[PDB]
Design a protein around this ligand. Structure first.
Ligand SMILES: [Ca+2]
Ligand SMILES: [Ca+2]
Ligand SMILES: [Ca+2]
Ligand SMILES: [Ca+2]
Ligand SMILES: [Mg+2]
Ligand SMILES: [Mg+2]
Ligand SMILES: [Mg+2]
Ligand SMILES: [Mg+2]
Ligand SMILES: [Mg+2]
Ligand SMILES: [Mg+2]
Ligand code: NA
Ligand code: NA
Ligand code: NA
Ligand code: NA
Lengths: 387, 386, 387, 386
């Protein structure tokens, strides 16, 4: 019955199940969770591991002895359960000091602090076994046009990520970075607002091989973009280092619904792509159990994340295995799309009368794509309504 | 005043003033314009030049003789007026053959044809003096998830742009390519949907230096993005080869309103950035006079594009030249943003207790950014209410 | 296997399957369909009936003898098949004369023409058995702020709909009107942009009982609204006279995908609501087979509209019948929502200490809503992944 | 100039200037403001009055004695300055008890409490002189489809508003209610999501004359709607009891920027309409100074709200007073829109061959609307570029 097990690689942030329910218009509806409790409960649900922001695990402003106690307890829970920590990240957004950014704050002293805060937590992430270190620059941006010279901000952004790369290289760490885009919220506009912008920026870093993306379902959907398509571009670039899975209903505030909620067909096509491409990284959920829920509802929502992935995995696999689908894909020329356009080379293409003077454009135009029949097979598979 | 002159480098597509007004739900409201009349009237309005899709200038399916006559007439009008042709592009979207794409059509024979159609028009563009060749892949994408394997499509897209680069290199042409993003419409989702996606894709081409972006105001706004921010990233990357200027009211179909319409404050900040950065390319308008209008309204709308650029240019310049604004920029630490974060280097940063152990976070957090005063000065300048 | 039959009340516009594929950036990809052919093909698919704009059935500008031939042929096909015509409408958007509107064109002569064109087709609709006459004011609106005084436009809009009501009353017709909202496209902003605006406007008409709404899935979704919620408000007002079913992916141009495409979960909740509320009107599809398709794909797409409704109907019925769901609904207090708040009356409420000084707000706040468990039962039912 | 004076009727919520800056992802950046300080500072800035939620003025859970002292201090500051309180409202959204709603909570005991909390504050509002009592049902709605039966919720909503109407009638109060729509946030979808939905709902209440709308600029824009159009429909219905003025950049979270920010041209057309229609209610700002700002930036941002209204008022008045604009309005047949379509009556229309049989559709279609010239005059006026 779609029961997750550790090899399914499902992970959760401490801040997900641990979200107390404060929003822009409301106070907390749930008590804080002890990270130890979350590790044990997630393990019992069949999770593979957890992730954290520095300040989720160690309260901001902790002394070194307080810090070591929080880390010791957490490590004992990880030890006891075999839960992994594949990813961690820095909170560069909550504290008021980051109101204008971390790495791109106009105040230089804040930018330096942001880097030091990040470096401290890289060391901890590495100790705990993380392979990826995520950066969500939620405060990088502006509400007004004069407040932020974006070229200079990108210079600062590059400087910061280059220093982090120099740091991990100097320590011999194999951890890689994953930049997480978001278009807006909490800033009016956030820098590097989409997968594409982040991918482009990475190509201007000194050591681009150390950086990839951590796309989040809902974030690309906040710009009305097709999440599967963006994932395909990330995979095509070799840069899908990690992913955040959740749900979102279109263009509005960041909802962080459980995975499978929001745009269900997009979730189907995402799972189909990840499985077809052989994505091997964590299936990480960055979600918030709605503040209507009590803790039983927290754990139900978490369990639903994993369940929906597994159901969708089964349906996508059935779709791709169905001989009727395989024939529909041929009818729609998906196989021709995989063939090089002109492996014969430029001069042969220029000399090919079949490609121009003798190309019967009308006959080609008349050939239907058969995409609706293919899509209704896909629908039937998703809904368990075959044959 | 605000009267354009050719040195302002304002350009217009033939398809802009020449839009006959057919929409999803409506027939044409205006007759077709002869390209020669558009060249002459835009010259009279103070334009610098014009641009075209192949099929705007030479009707699809024209014989060689027909083609020659269309081109000859056009060149006579250009030569008579001194109008330039800084950019051209291919129509890979109107003909039914392109219903699933040009470069990324599932049908391989269509992909080959798309390349041949493009190459024919690159040759013409070069003869006319174009510096940039635009590509808007408006039919590249899908309405359904199974229809288009996006990784394979990106392989096909790369192969196409690489062949075009090979072609121009083989002919010794100086022309460069500019990819124009759009997120959707006419496809349910279009590949390379934003400036970012196009910039990223370019870095995987074999000769990336030959390709840049042609961002369009309204297209980025159809994804709710900040167009000035995206232009800043394109400038930062050295890839703002060309631009399309127009207006758009948020997230909906592509409106192509005259420049200045739609998001007026975004237009202000865009002009401020282009002028500040020294963008030297064409100020090209890709707009549609609304189908409500007759030809007099066509030419009014075109004149409005240029007028609005010029008004905004004045206001942005006055903003930047105002000592009170310069004071406010300092108060908001725009100057500190330009200083390197850690020119002292990594080790020095690590050893700096003022950056962590002894950093007074509370004192830093208490410092207001003064962004609202700065923005109200910007508003006052925009509105001529100083 | 989810095969539609006439009592399922599925209807289609002539302009749906007959869409030739012209868009803003492209020429037609399919030949025109003879209305006779469409009637016969839709009948063979299990449709209940068809609908039309005047100009779909009789080419604009037809002489009276040409008109009668087109109508005669159509009537013979309806006769032969038993297909019904439950609804018709006017094309007040295609011809250039309507570039600034029909009923709210600034030019008075155009407004009068629009009314005459509409009245002529009301008579035909009535003859053919229509119960509803739809009005989509696609050209009513503006691209710029000075072009349209909206108060005066609403005066004109009211005048027009009042005249139509006076007309149908004068002829003793039992046909009712259904206003179809859309927020934008082809105008920059369209008047009466949502279900709510249309419902409100109707209350200012002289004979409000003669008018309701014809909401379309995709149109409310073009404003990012929840279509099921808007339908619930229409039903609550007694004004769901007709509906247009299709699919849409969020905030963008009007896609008119086949029903079930676009927002699949919204389609589920819509069907659940229509069936639970006992909506008895036509299940009408206003969709466009994508221009990628040939005619085989046209008919496949049409068939998919009906199939998806039927699958969703089955899943919603299973959801509501499941005792586990019935208990989850009780756990979430859906039953309490159905109870009057204060049937004891205002004074009793004011005197009830349990409602204020003695109300334990903390204990109430602590009670989780259990909405995630309920929603995951709903997901499991939609996907055929129970128990 | 553009200096506000009390006669301009500018008002502000205590929660606006008093917003401490907590957002989804961030802690407060400013200390709490004492309501008395806000009254005095807004008076000094030229405001007419202030508004409040119950819990802005009297901390939730305050004892009777505490409550009396908070109210006494506030009234002394009002009386000292002559500031008015034209509107008040209830906080039915912050406390966890309201997590599924107030009036439409699934839990009946919560619904009853919500009503009692509202009624207590209506009494206070009346004592302070409020003419309008706002209701923003920000927690009424759902994140999932099964959670909320919307027809039953609308029954509960109607029952609540009817009880409130019964209450005010029973006490002989003159106060009227204004429902404030919002489409989403904090709920995934909020009930009564737009002006239209609220206007429709009001017509099903037992005493519809007692209820109107309190539209907010940014809320309608979160659905991509045209705010001036929605205000025109509210005015047409006789239901614009109050308004919330602010700025928003399109479809995203509720920004609550200062008025004039966001969609500047929409702000222009809004002011033009309010002034033209003779709206006589408060010009109320529901805005948040960005959390980047310190208190000096709070007061700058508040001053900016009023300044921008005044600049736009000037420019809209100059537009309407310009004989060239009046000419253009005639050219675009705005005057013909005001004439009845068929005052001759139905039969005359039916018998009029000039309306159908002999109507020259082509000649009519050829007549340009001249809307672009009109809009460029409007742009020129807005920008002070005539
Ligand atoms: Ca998120
Ligand atoms: Ca465009
Ligand atoms: Ca539609
Ligand atoms: Ca707001
Ligand atoms: Mg995330
Ligand atoms: Mg493959
Ligand atoms: Mg363009
Ligand atoms: Mg429709
Ligand atoms: Mg019921
Ligand atoms: Mg408000
Ligand atoms: Na939420
Ligand atoms: Na051609
Ligand atoms: Na489409
Ligand atoms: Na209180």
């Amino acid at each position: 019955n779609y029961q997750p097990t550790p090899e399914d690689r499902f992970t959760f942030g401490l801040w997900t199940v641990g979200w107390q329910g404060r929003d822009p218009f409301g106070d907390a509806t749930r008590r804080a969770l002890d990270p130890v409790e979350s590790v044990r409960r997630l393990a019992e649900l069949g999770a593979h591991g957890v992730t954290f922001h520095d300040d989720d695990l160690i309260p901001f402003g902790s002394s070194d002895s307080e810090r070591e106690e929080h880390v010791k307890r957490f490590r004992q829970a990880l030890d006891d359960t075999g839960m992994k920590v594949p990813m961690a990240t820095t909170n560069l957004f909550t504290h008021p000091v980051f109101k204008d950014g971390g790495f791109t704050a106009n105040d230089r002293d804040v930018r330096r602090y942001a880097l030091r805060k990040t470096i401290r937590n890289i060391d901890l992430a590495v100790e705990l076994g993380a392979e990826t270190y995520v950066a969500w620059g939620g405060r990088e941006g502006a509400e007004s046009g004069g407040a932020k010279d974006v070229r200079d901000a990108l210079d600062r952004m590059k400087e910061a990520f280059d220093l982090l790369g120099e740091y991990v290289t100097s320590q011999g760490y194999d951890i890689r970075f994953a930049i997480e885009p978001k278009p807006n919220e909490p800033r009016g506009d956030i820098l590097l607002p989409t997968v594409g912008h982040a991918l482009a920026f990475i190509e201007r870093l000194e050591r681009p091989e150390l950086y990839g993306v951590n796309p989040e379902v809902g974030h690309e959907q906040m710009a009305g973009l097709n999440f599967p398509h963006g994932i395909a571009q990330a995979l095509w670039a070799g840069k899908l280092f990690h992913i955040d899975l959740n749900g979102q209903n279109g263009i509005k505030y960041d909802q962080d619904l459980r995975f499978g909620a929001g745009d269900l067909r997009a979730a189907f096509w995402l799972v189909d792509l990840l499985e077809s491409a052989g994505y091997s990284g964590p299936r990480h959920f960055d979600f918030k159990p709605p503040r209507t829920e009590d803790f039983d509802g927290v754990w139900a929502s978490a369990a639903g994340c994993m369940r929906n992935y597994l159901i969708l995995k089964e349906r996508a696999a059935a779709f791709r295995a169905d001989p009727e689908v395989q024939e529909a894909l041929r009818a729609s020329r998906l196989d021709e799309l995989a063939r090089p356009t002109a492996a014969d080379g430029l001069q042969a293409l220029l000399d090919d009368r079949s490609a121009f003077e003798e190309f019967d454009v009308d006959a080609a135009a008349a050939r239907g794509m058969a995409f609706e029949r293919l899509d209704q097979l896909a629908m039937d598979h998703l809904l368990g309504a075959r044959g």
